[PDB]
C-alpha cells in the first residue's frame, strides 16, 4: 500500500488549509486573520489568559523551535531522503545481482548440456583406429606376401642369370686360351696385305 | 573404408582428467595410422607370370609358385573390438540422456524462480515480509539473537 | 684371317657342351661355390626354392571404456 505523496497542507505549522477554505466562501482572505486577532485580544484582555513569566519562557522556546525548523528543515528532509533512495538503489542491486547470477547458472548448464552432446567423439576415435588397425594389418599382410613370392622368383632368376654370365665369361676365357697352341699361309696374306698398302 | 572425421579440441574437451594420457596415446595413435596407411597402397603389384615364364628355366617353380599364390586366401582378421565400444557408446549416451534430462529439470526451475523475482512487487509498495520471501538473506534470525535486535549489535 | 677361323671353330666346340656340364672348366668351383654362398644369405637362409610359408601376426589391444 503506497504513501500518498504530500501531507496536508498546513499553515504556520499551526492551522491547515481546510480550515481557510472552509470558511473562504463565508468571509474569505479576511475570515480567519479576524478571528484570531479577536479571539487573541479576547483571552488577552478578559483575564483568560494570564501574562507571567510563562510567556517570556513560551516565547523563548517558540523563537528557538522556528528558528530551529527553518534553518535545519531541509537538512533532515534530504537526509531522509537519502537513506530512502540509498536503502532502494541497495535494493535494486540485490535484485539484479541475483537475476544476473541465476542467469549464469542457466548459462553454465547449457554449456554442460552442449559438451556431454559432444561426447561422441570418443567412441568415433576409438572407431577410427579400429578399422585403420586392422586395414594396416591386412595390407601389411598382403605386402609380405607380395615380398616374399617376388624374393624367391628374384633369387632364383638371379642365380640364375649369375651362372649364365660366369659360365659365358668362362667359355669366352676358354677359347681365347686354347685357340693359341694352334703354316706360312698367313705370311703369304701378310705379303698380300702389304701389297694392298697403296 | 568407414571412417569417421572428427574435431580434435572437442575431443579434448570431453576427456575426464583422470585419464589424459591414455587419450593422448590414442590420438597419436590414430594420427600414427593415418600415416602409415598413407605410407603404403591400397594392394600389391600382383606379379606377373610371363616375365618370369620367359626367365625362370626351372620347371613348374614359377608355375606351382603362382598357382599356390593363387590358392593362397590371407586371412582378412575380424575385429570382434567393435560391438564392445558400440555398446560401451550405447550406455555412455543413456547415462548422459539421464544427465541431461535432470539438467533440463534444474534450468526450468531456475527459469521460474527467475521469473518470480522479475515479476516483484515494487519496492516502496513491499511489506518486509515480501522482502523476507523474495530473499532468505534479509531474514533477522530470531532464533540464535531472540532479544532486540535479534542481532550483532556492531553489525547495525 | 686368324681370329675368324678362331670364332668359327670356337664358337663350334662352345656348342658342343651336351657333353660338358661346364664345358671343360675344370676350376672356378671355389669361387662359384662361396659367390652363390654369399648371393644367398644376402638374399636369404631358407628353402628359397620351395613355396613360401606364412605366419600372421595380429595387433595389439587395450581396455578402452572409462575404468
Known sequence: PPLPEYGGKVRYGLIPEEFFQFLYPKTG?????????????????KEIYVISAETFTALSVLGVMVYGIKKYGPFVADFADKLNEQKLAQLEEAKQASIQHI?????????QQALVQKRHYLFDVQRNNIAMALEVTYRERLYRVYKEVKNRLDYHISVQNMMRRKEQEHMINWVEKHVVQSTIAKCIADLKLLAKKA | LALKTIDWVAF???????????????????????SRLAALPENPPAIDWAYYKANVAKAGLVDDFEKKFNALKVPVPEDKYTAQVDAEEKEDVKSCAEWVSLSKARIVEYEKEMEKMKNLI?????????????????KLDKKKYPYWPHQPIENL | QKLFVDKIREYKSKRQTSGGPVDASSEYQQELERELFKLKQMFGNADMNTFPTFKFEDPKFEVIEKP
Open chain 1, 29 to 45: 482572505v479576511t475570515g480567519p486573520y479576524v478571528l484570531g486577532t479577536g479571539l487573541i485580544l479576547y483571552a488577552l484582555s
Open chain 1, 103 to 111: 542467469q549464469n547458472a542457466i548459462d553454465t548448464e547449457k554449456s
Open chain 2, 12 to 34: 579434448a574437451e570431453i576427456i575426464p582428467q583422470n585419464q589424459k594420457a591414455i587419450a593422448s596415446s590414442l590420438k597419436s595413435w590414430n594420427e600414427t595410422l593415418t
Open chain 2, 122 to 138: 515494487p519496492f516502496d509498495q513491499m511489506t518486509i515480509e515480501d522482502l523476507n520471501e523474495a530473499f532468505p538473506e534479509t
